[PDB]
Design an enzyme around this catalytic site. Structure first.
Site, short mmCIF file in Angstrom:
data_model
loop_
_atom_site.label_atom_id
_atom_site.label_comp_id
_atom_site.label_asym_id
_atom_site.label_seq_id
_atom_site.Cartn_x
_atom_site.Cartn_y
_atom_site.Cartn_z
N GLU C 59 0.82 -1.31 0.00
CA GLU C 59 0.08 -0.05 0.10
C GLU C 59 0.75 1.36 0.02
N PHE C 121 -11.12 -5.01 15.10
CA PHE C 121 -10.31 -5.76 14.56
C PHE C 121 -10.11 -4.99 12.82
N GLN C 122 -8.73 -4.96 12.45
CA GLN C 122 -8.61 -4.72 11.15
C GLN C 122 -8.57 -3.24 11.12
N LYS C 171 -17.12 0.01 6.62
CA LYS C 171 -17.72 -1.19 5.80
C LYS C 171 -18.83 -1.38 5.94
N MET C 485 23.16 9.19 0.80
CA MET C 485 22.76 10.59 1.13
C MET C 485 23.79 10.77 2.37
C1 LIG Z 1 18.18 15.92 1.02
C2 LIG Z 1 17.25 16.96 0.22
C3 LIG Z 1 17.89 17.94 -0.19
C4 LIG Z 1 17.52 18.69 -0.95
N1 LIG Z 1 18.10 20.02 -1.36
C5 LIG Z 1 17.21 20.98 -2.22
C6 LIG Z 1 18.07 22.22 -2.67
O1 LIG Z 1 19.30 22.33 -2.32
N2 LIG Z 1 17.46 23.15 -3.53
C7 LIG Z 1 16.05 23.01 -3.91
O2 LIG Z 1 15.57 23.61 -4.51
N3 LIG Z 1 15.30 21.69 -3.59
C8 LIG Z 1 16.22 20.76 -2.46
N4 LIG Z 1 15.15 19.66 -2.13
C9 LIG Z 1 13.97 19.47 -2.58
C10 LIG Z 1 13.10 20.18 -1.66
O3 LIG Z 1 12.96 19.50 -0.44
C11 LIG Z 1 11.69 20.42 -2.17
O4 LIG Z 1 11.90 20.43 -3.87
C12 LIG Z 1 10.96 21.71 -2.09
O5 LIG Z 1 11.18 22.04 -0.57
C13 LIG Z 1 9.62 21.70 -2.53
O6 LIG Z 1 9.43 22.12 -3.84
P1 LIG Z 1 8.82 23.49 -4.04
O7 LIG Z 1 8.98 24.45 -2.77
O8 LIG Z 1 9.64 24.49 -5.07
O9 LIG Z 1 7.37 23.36 -4.65
P2 LIG Z 1 6.33 22.58 -3.55
O10 LIG Z 1 6.57 22.75 -2.21
O11 LIG Z 1 6.20 21.04 -4.06
O12 LIG Z 1 4.79 23.09 -4.12
C14 LIG Z 1 5.05 24.66 -4.49
C15 LIG Z 1 4.83 25.44 -3.21
O13 LIG Z 1 3.93 27.00 -3.88
C16 LIG Z 1 2.81 26.78 -3.78
N5 LIG Z 1 1.98 25.82 -4.61
C17 LIG Z 1 1.47 24.63 -4.88
N6 LIG Z 1 0.70 24.13 -5.92
C18 LIG Z 1 0.66 25.46 -6.56
C19 LIG Z 1 -0.04 25.80 -7.71
N7 LIG Z 1 -0.72 24.62 -8.24
N8 LIG Z 1 0.00 27.06 -8.13
C20 LIG Z 1 0.83 27.86 -7.69
N9 LIG Z 1 1.32 27.80 -6.27
C21 LIG Z 1 1.45 26.62 -5.90
C22 LIG Z 1 2.54 25.75 -2.53
O14 LIG Z 1 2.26 26.30 -1.62
C23 LIG Z 1 3.70 25.20 -2.45
O15 LIG Z 1 4.24 25.16 -1.14
C24 LIG Z 1 16.06 18.90 -1.49
C25 LIG Z 1 15.45 17.49 -1.05
C26 LIG Z 1 15.97 16.78 -0.14
C27 LIG Z 1 15.41 15.19 0.20
C1 LIG Z 2 -7.52 -11.88 9.09
C2 LIG Z 2 -7.74 -12.27 10.51
C3 LIG Z 2 -8.35 -13.31 11.16
C4 LIG Z 2 -8.44 -13.62 12.74
N1 LIG Z 2 -9.16 -14.35 13.08
C5 LIG Z 2 -9.24 -14.49 14.29
C6 LIG Z 2 -10.08 -15.81 14.96
O1 LIG Z 2 -10.90 -16.26 14.19
N2 LIG Z 2 -10.03 -15.94 16.56
C7 LIG Z 2 -9.21 -15.15 17.31
O2 LIG Z 2 -9.33 -15.36 18.42
N3 LIG Z 2 -8.36 -13.99 16.79
C8 LIG Z 2 -8.41 -13.89 15.37
N4 LIG Z 2 -7.67 -13.06 14.60
C9 LIG Z 2 -6.81 -12.08 15.67
C10 LIG Z 2 -7.83 -10.99 16.18
O3 LIG Z 2 -7.82 -9.86 15.12
C11 LIG Z 2 -7.14 -10.52 17.72
O4 LIG Z 2 -5.85 -10.37 17.35
C12 LIG Z 2 -7.15 -11.57 18.60
O5 LIG Z 2 -8.38 -11.22 19.58
C13 LIG Z 2 -5.94 -11.49 19.59
O6 LIG Z 2 -6.42 -11.88 21.01
P1 LIG Z 2 -6.46 -10.40 21.86
O7 LIG Z 2 -6.33 -9.01 20.88
O8 LIG Z 2 -7.92 -10.27 22.52
O9 LIG Z 2 -5.66 -10.32 23.25
P2 LIG Z 2 -4.27 -9.44 23.01
O10 LIG Z 2 -3.45 -9.49 21.57
O11 LIG Z 2 -3.18 -9.59 24.19
O12 LIG Z 2 -4.89 -7.99 23.19
C14 LIG Z 2 -4.41 -6.88 24.01
C15 LIG Z 2 -5.49 -7.21 25.33
O13 LIG Z 2 -5.07 -8.46 26.06
C16 LIG Z 2 -4.53 -8.00 27.39
N5 LIG Z 2 -3.14 -8.01 27.65
C17 LIG Z 2 -1.96 -7.70 26.98
N6 LIG Z 2 -0.97 -7.77 27.86
C18 LIG Z 2 -1.67 -8.33 28.94
C19 LIG Z 2 -0.97 -8.50 30.25
N7 LIG Z 2 0.45 -8.50 30.48
N8 LIG Z 2 -1.75 -8.95 31.29
C20 LIG Z 2 -3.02 -9.13 31.23
N9 LIG Z 2 -3.46 -8.77 30.05
C21 LIG Z 2 -2.96 -8.19 29.00
C22 LIG Z 2 -4.32 -6.65 26.78
O14 LIG Z 2 -4.28 -5.59 28.05
C23 LIG Z 2 -5.57 -6.32 25.84
O15 LIG Z 2 -6.70 -6.61 26.92
C24 LIG Z 2 -7.69 -12.80 13.52
C25 LIG Z 2 -6.97 -11.65 12.73
C26 LIG Z 2 -6.79 -11.66 11.51
C27 LIG Z 2 -5.95 -10.43 10.94
#
Ligand SMILES: Cc1cc2nc3c(=O)[nH]c(=O)nc-3n(C[C@H](O)[C@H](O)[C@H](O)COP(=O)(O)OP(=O)(O)OC[C@H]3O[C@@H](n4cnc5c(N)ncnc54)[C@H](O)[C@@H]3O)c2cc1C
Ligand SMILES: Cc1cc2nc3c(=O)[nH]c(=O)nc-3n(C[C@H](O)[C@H](O)[C@H](O)COP(=O)(O)OP(=O)(O)OC[C@H]3O[C@@H](n4cnc5c(N)ncnc54)[C@H](O)[C@@H]3O)c2cc1C
Ligand SMILES: Cc1ncc(C[n+]2csc(CCOP(=O)(O)OP(=O)(O)O)c2C)c(N)n1
Ligand SMILES: Cc1ncc(C[n+]2csc(CCOP(=O)(O)OP(=O)(O)O)c2C)c(N)n1
Ligand SMILES: [Mg+2]
Ligand SMILES: [Mg+2]
Lengths: 169, 155, 582, 582, 155
Positions: C59, C121-122, C171, C485
């Site tokens: 994601e 859950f989830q 949901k 970097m």
């Molecule tokens: C490690 C690192 C180093 C970097 N070093 C540099 C450097 O040395 N020099 C440099 O230039 N960049 C550098 N950058 C990139 C920099 O972080 C970003 O590019 C910059 O901060 C954001 O780009 P911007 O401000 O020009 O435009 P953006 O912030 O992306 O957007 C433009 C800004 O103007 C306005 N705006 C937004 N949309 C519109 C629109 N449709 N019409 C009109 N105005 C708008 C918004 O307020 C926005 O804040 C670096 C990045 C990293 C990760």
């Molecule tokens: C796709 C999917 C399907 C699932 N299907 C099932 C299913 O069919 N049946 C099922 O049971 N689960 C299922 N699960 C897991 C479910 O989502 C929960 O994670 C499950 O209930 C875990 O048990 P719990 O959260 O209740 O206990 P915990 O994982 O421990 O959650 C914490 C809770 O227990 C207590 N606890 C934690 N630490 C302590 C401690 N030191 N002392 C006392 N209490 C404590 C916490 O205080 C809190 O109350 C599924 C999960 C997924 C992602």
């Protein structure tokens, strides 16, 4: 450790009157910005605005207005924010209720309600174990009462945070 | 269905809190919080059943910074909610908001020729009055804090 | 008129409402890792043939395929993950699309809405996980407003700074049946308050009133000219400003004309840093002004007068203070710049030959050279070899790192979106899956790709996606057994050690690791392995005529390092002059 | 303590602190991937001769390895990564570690503090994206916090409800010079204020008193007793209450005795389904009542009273509410429960075997049976003979789906820390890096690792990291050329609609794809392609013959189905013993 | 930018004081003073920068009779300014000055049929309200004392 602390302001202490939708998580999208902009939120008080369906958050942020201009437009980047108003550079009402439970005896309860009569604090609830004031007004009158009720047996100061509107006067 | 939360030393304390109503999908009816350098007392009403209220009073204690969560709903509380309503102050219709702020017994902090600002304070039953009764005059901008509760403590 | 797959008054599964609303935007390719919880949408896909499932092998590869299909088309790409763990793997690419300003849409299933966030859950409450790293999220709770938010998503994908929209669907929502109320408006009331209006020439006056005041201009273009095909080239045809193209803007200016400054900044071309750190008006067209291009905020073109044109209002003044600032869609406001300035075409300056003379003496004095230590192929040669052989235009993907800038500084780009980059995210693992999305954005066109030794392997699963989809990806693996970097970030930061940079096996360090021949032959794909320059033009010759995909494996010399590289908070005074790994 | 590899009274770098901070918490191995900010740890991680960084290829494979090394230790795993993409691929394994309760520390190199917020370089806001999917997280801001952060981190990861912890260390913070007070104690007053107490003894008899009015009890173990070697089985050896594990409850009881039932649930075994639903006393012992367990919200043991005990207070009654509950660490809560029953020995027998033999007549009647179709090797046969080839000491690791299920409902897991899967999350691509971590926490165990059709290929990043480390990652492949779990979803629910559930090229249907033997040849491992009845155990014999790793491409029929599979949220009566693929 | 002055035994104490803002050319925004037989506490706000405020807090100590000058501006003060507004009391428009003196919470000392006199007291923010809000009714003659400040003393 019982009472809430003294006051909710520093020197910078900007106030932003948010105006957001009534989304169920709309506080967390707004203070999510104060967190993700690295701002401590010094005080906050949300509530429903004049058009029922939107909210209104009144915040307190310790940030200078350069950094607040990096927030008021940044809070506009949220979807639900209809407007923000930097009230701090304007005259603005600053009223904040503050529910102060104070454990008192009988004779000391006399020497508390008079202080509550000074601040026009409606003593909303009283017992023999305690009395609970409810004052309202600016934060200086809030901190003055808590500075003056620290001599008495204070309890949970359930405040509410600075609420603001910029006065037209 | 209301909750008082006391939290400890972190920044963005609300983000832990206002997250775990959103990411738990359980809507807050209102919220307000008196934050400080390390302490903050949230007061959160969550429009849900007492079953899901029992979850979030403990699921908020899955957070670490929470010193205390108390479901204050069962207690006789003092729900006090401030509402700094800015009302259009036109003197043809200002003339009755005078008593209609005296009835709710609220100060009027700032007045202009077309905008006055009142400070209605207290019971949310009285607050939803003002949100409806003073809605019959054209409201500029209601701002309101959240409902704050405390124990009406006896033993 | 939309060709409706079913009746307009058929109460059906919400995935049918969902998958019709995708094609009702006018999209054609999804990337749908199959659903144990997003099950119906793959099922409702299978009753459609206008939409295409390129089912990824991962994601993260899927969203990078949705990244590549976005930023090699411009149409807002759509990934689909399974709920929960699949949706956690988008969080890579969603962090790309917000940082790199990529129009993305992430449809994802959720659990039953009676089970959301119950430690179920989830499940991953990914609407609240990716709140900080998407342009918007969604957690729709009814069937009837599924295409409400979908068209709102494709609104939010296209509009403003083009971000990702994770759109979630529970949901049991698609397992709830209802009728599709299609044409309802954008429930989007706050975003229309900053839906950026066209900035008129009165707002563009104080640019063109300062163009003649500009003696030393520079055209700091970037990802905002991602739509400007020739409009930037028309702008430099009007007034002649030496360019400074960043990474998402590489391509926008076709980087083979007279002002051929490829990439600027801390890792750019040193003679484009000379073009930007010597300007008196820093003209910017769509850049985000990041740390690794600016160094210091106050010294990056400190002697300049910054103007900065963006569709995003929040970006204006975010990292860099602008002198005078004007918002607005650049390609729209460039059509309202070049097609209005012809009244001033006998009025404007055009006096930049004395500024074109500065770059010309520093073009060759600040060169793009290398070190052919024996015959171990300079990859900086091998991309100049690439455009010698790729017949001009080539849609090129990258991973990130030392092999990212080797695409940047050493390819002559000819069109925007014929170039891919995880620039802002720096997403290792971008290369091979962005080659997927480009191979359905521009399928018949040359989708070449270059990857590093880790970032290829970091997303190497998507090799199997190619043979399933017959994609003609042309991947070049710039292997050096090394984290290419940060091995330079050993040397020019603190110490010339080899602290965990060595990706390869220390038992066969002289030998290839891993064997990418037996990677592509594992998925039946043809491959190559190059280390000598005589076969370098030979292997690319075998690459661009290969039916379907092709892999190759150049060997980057593991101790070759690229100019420039400054510590963060630096100027061109703190450039490196010749830094290698030896 | 241990040997200090550093002067205990001298202010040095954060990098000096960080690797020592884990070394002052007994860490022997971290799964650290270096990057733009994480490299400063790797400058000092090489300096730790104790902590050998198992370098991954994908950090998702790294963070999955910090689960195999976690859930085969009891010690928490550590995955270190970088901002940008390295942080946004922990989020798979972090969401794995949140849901299945895997203790984990996610160190992450963060952007410098001046460049924080602004998203200057690759700043994904990590504590703002991973605030959900971790138990806690720590964007540190000063280096003096880092010891009290990391002592809290290993407190929060290991103790409590054991979940994942993240730590964001900024790049300048690791470069900053400060003092490593290990006796800077934990300023974590919230968690230790209700860090759950030992359960009181009179509360423990209330469970024992509930056995007396329950001639039909059932023990429902989950991952709680994963910290118990014999302490669960001794309780069943004390009292004849029949075991019934869940998926992560596998291993905790020794699931090979004659009393031993199996994983219950929806894809759990039906002879474990009768025991849980006809019972009177659910001993929900360290288990969280999941939705692959309950089926219907009410029709899971509706005629049974429930004791649910767990180390989490909040998890108690998150689903349908039990009758009596302690918030006890069940490793300790058994050790007072067993205390009374060796004392209260035999005045109440509690060994009413006719309720056990109500299911021992069902132990054979609805067994772990299937049909071999043709001379090709059937899928769940190979995992079945894997157990008898491995003495049940082989710590499994698996991905998700059929090869999670057919791994689960056949194998005999003697010890706990033996079933190593993404459970409640269901992170595909887990097992191949789960065994990577399991090759470190139990580095001389015979860690065989069943993978699947897709979930092998999703993380063949880490097939490189076997060869760099020479681990016995004996990678079994339950490949069946198709993502079969969702194929098993699609036929029993919706019209058998092949939404590319087949992984390989559908123009290459009747052939093996990919030829994943050369994946092992890509690194240097040998492999094995098993396709018929002629090599059932034969290559699996050569698996344990070959030292170090192996691959075993057991290609299975392209249509297969996991039995049972209750409908999603379905009633107990729709348990099945069917497969419909042929 | 406000100053409290305590002065000693002289007559025409103000002439020393109100001179040395005029002859120093630094304008007073307002002034008021409670003179007595030998003591007087001036309260002077001077609309200038803190640099020139630093001069006149010491240049007023170039005068001899000044016992003490304290720049009270940095302190949390209590700026209270009285304003005896005489308003035209026409009962067509008197009818809303009723509450618009109740809002500012001021006594009304003397009323005629066309002239009533109110006693608005306190914060100059509230005083410039009345100078604007009650300017919308025709004002006969505002007289106002100067803004008076004191230390909100804590330690
Ligand atoms: C490690 C690192 C180093 C970097 N070093 C540099 C450097 O040395 N020099 C440099 O230039 N960049 C550098 N950058 C990139 C920099 O972080 C970003 O590019 C910059 O901060 C954001 O780009 P911007 O401000 O020009 O435009 P953006 O912030 O992306 O957007 C433009 C800004 O103007 C306005 N705006 C937004 N949309 C519109 C629109 N449709 N019409 C009109 N105005 C708008 C918004 O307020 C926005 O804040 C670096 C990045 C990293 C990760
Ligand atoms: C796709 C999917 C399907 C699932 N299907 C099932 C299913 O069919 N049946 C099922 O049971 N689960 C299922 N699960 C897991 C479910 O989502 C929960 O994670 C499950 O209930 C875990 O048990 P719990 O959260 O209740 O206990 P915990 O994982 O421990 O959650 C914490 C809770 O227990 C207590 N606890 C934690 N630490 C302590 C401690 N030191 N002392 C006392 N209490 C404590 C916490 O205080 C809190 O109350 C599924 C999960 C997924 C992602
Ligand atoms: C998962 C991850 N780790 C680290 C980084 C920082 N980083 C980007 S590239 C790179 C090394 C470059 O290696 P590769 O991508 O294979 O190309 P090369 O330069 O070696 O040719 C590093 C450490 C990253 N973006 N992602
Ligand atoms: C990351 C992720 N992607 C998708 C899913 C949904 N899912 C669970 S099992 C499964 C089938 C894939 O299993 P595979 O690796 O192909 O081997 P199989 O079990 O089918 O024999 C799928 C698509 C998931 N739980 N996690
Ligand atoms: Mg590389
Ligand atoms: Mg499969």
């Amino acid at each position: 450790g019982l009472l809430t602390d003294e006051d909710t302001s520093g020197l910078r202490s900007h106030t932003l009157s948010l105006l957001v939708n009534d989304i169920p998580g709309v506080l967390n999208i707004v203070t999510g910005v104060f967190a993700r902009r690295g701002y401590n939120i010094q005080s906050l008080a949300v509530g429903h605005a004049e058009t029922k369906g939107i909210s209104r958050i009144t915040t307190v942020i310790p940030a200078t207005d350069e950094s607040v201009s990096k927030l008021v437009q940044q809070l506009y980047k949220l979807v639900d924010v209809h407007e923000v108003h930097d009230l701090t550079h304007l005259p603005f009402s600053e009223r904040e209720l503050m529910l102060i439970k104070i454990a008192v005896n009988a004779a000391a309860r006399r020497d508390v309600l008079d202080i509550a009569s000074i601040f026009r604090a409606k003593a909303v609830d009283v017992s023999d174990h305690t009395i609970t004031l409810q004052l309202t007004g600016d934060l200086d009158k809030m901190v003055a009462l808590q500075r003056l009720l620290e001599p008495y047996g204070i309890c949970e100061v359930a405040r509410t945070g600075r609420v603001a509107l910029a006065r037209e006067s | 269905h209301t909750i008082s939360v006391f939290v400890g030393d972190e920044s963005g304390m609300i983000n832990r809190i206002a997250g775990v109503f959103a990411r738990r999908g359980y809507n807050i009816e209102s919220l307000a919080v008196g934050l400080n350098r390390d302490k903050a007392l949230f007061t959160i009403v969550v429009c849900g059943t007492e079953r899901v209220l029992q979850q979030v009073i403990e699921q908020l204690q899955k957070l670490v910074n929470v010193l205390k969560v108390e479901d204050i709903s069962s207690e006789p509380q003092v729900e006090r909610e401030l509402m700094l309503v800015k009302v259009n102050a036109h003197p043809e219709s200002r003339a009755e908001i005078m008593w209609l702020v005296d009835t709710f017994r609220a100060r009027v902090v700032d007045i202009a020729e077309h905008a006055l600002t009142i400070e209605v304070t207290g019971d949310p039953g009285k607050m939803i009055a003002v949100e409806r009764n003073l809605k019959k005059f054209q409201i500029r901008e209601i701002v309101r804090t959240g409902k704050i509760a405390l124990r009406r403590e006896k033993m | 008129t939309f060709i409706s797959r079913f009746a307009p008054d058929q109460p059906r599964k919400g995935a049918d409402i969902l998958v019709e609303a995708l094609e009702r935007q006018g999209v054609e390719t999804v990337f749908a890792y199959p659903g144990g919880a997003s099950m119906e949408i793959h099922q409702a896909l299978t009753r459609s043939s206008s939409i295409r499932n390129v089912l990824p092998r991962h994601e993260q590869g899927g969203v990078f395929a949705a990244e590549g299909y976005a930023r090699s088309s411009g149409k807002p790409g759509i990934c689909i993950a399974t709920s929960g763990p699949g949706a956690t793997n988008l969080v890579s690419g969603l962090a790309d699309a917000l940082l790199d300003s990529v129009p993305l849409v992430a449809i994802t299933g959720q659990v039953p809405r009676r089970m959301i966030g119950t430690d179920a859950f989830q499940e991953t409450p990914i609407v609240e996980v990716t709140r900080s790293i998407t342009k918007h999220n969604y957690l729709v709770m009814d069937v009837e407003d599924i295409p409400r938010i979908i068209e709102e998503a494709f609104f939010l994908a296209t509009s403003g700074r083009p971000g990702p929209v994770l759109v979630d669907v529970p949901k049991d929502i698609q397992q709830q049946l209802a009728i599709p109320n299609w044409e309802q408006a954008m429930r989007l009331p706050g975003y229309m308050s900053r839906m950026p209006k066209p900035p008129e020439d009165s707002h563009l006056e104080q640019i063109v009133r300062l163009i003649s005041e500009s003696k030393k201009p520079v055209l700091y273009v970037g990802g905002g000219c991602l739509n400007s095909s020739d409009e930037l080239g028309r702008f430099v045809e009007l007034t002649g400003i030496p360019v400074a193209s960043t990474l998402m803007g590489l391509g926008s200016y076709p980087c083979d004309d007279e002002l051929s400054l490829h990439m600027l900044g801390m890792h750019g071309t040193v003679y484009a840093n000379y073009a930007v750190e010597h300007s008196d008006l820093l003209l910017a067209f769509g850049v985000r002004f990041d740390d690794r291009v600016t160094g210091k905020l106050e010294a990056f073109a400190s002697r300049a007068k910054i103007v900065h044109i963006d569709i995003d209002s929040a970006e204006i003044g975010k990292n860099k203070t602008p002198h005078v600032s004007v918002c607005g869609d650049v390609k729209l406001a460039l059509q309202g710049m070049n097609k209005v300035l012809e009244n001033r075409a006998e009025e404007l300056k055009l006096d930049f030959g004395v500024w074109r003379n500065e770059l010309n003496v520093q073009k060759q004095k600040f060169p793009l050279s290398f070190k052919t230590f024996g015959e171990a192929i300079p990859p900086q040669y091998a991309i100049k070899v690439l455009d010698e052989l790729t017949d001009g235009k080539a849609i090129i993907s990258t991973g990130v790192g030392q092999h990212q800038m080797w695409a940047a500084q050493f390819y002559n780009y000819k069109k925007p979106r014929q170039w891919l980059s995880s620039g802002g995210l720096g997403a290792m693992g971008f290369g091979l899956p962005a080659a997927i999305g480009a191979s359905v954005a521009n399928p018949d066109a040359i989708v070449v790709d270059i990857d590093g030794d880790g970032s290829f392997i970091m997303n190497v699963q998507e090799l199997a996606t190619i043979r399933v989809e017959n994609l003609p990806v042309k991947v070049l693996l710039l292997n050096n057994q090394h984290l290419g970097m940060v091995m330079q970030w050993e040397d020019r930061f603190y110490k010339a050690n080899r602290a965990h940079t060595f990706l390869g096996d220390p038992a066969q360090e002289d030998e290839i690791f891993p064997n990418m021949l037996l990677f592509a032959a594992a998925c039946g794909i043809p491959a190559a392995r190059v280390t000598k320059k005589a076969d370098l033009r030979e292997a690319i010759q075998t690459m661009l005529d290969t039916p379907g995909p092709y892999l190759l494996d150049v060997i980057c010399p593991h101790q070759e390092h690229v100019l420039p590289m400054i510590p963060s908070g630096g100027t061109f005074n703190d450039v490196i002059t010749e830094g290698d790994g030896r």
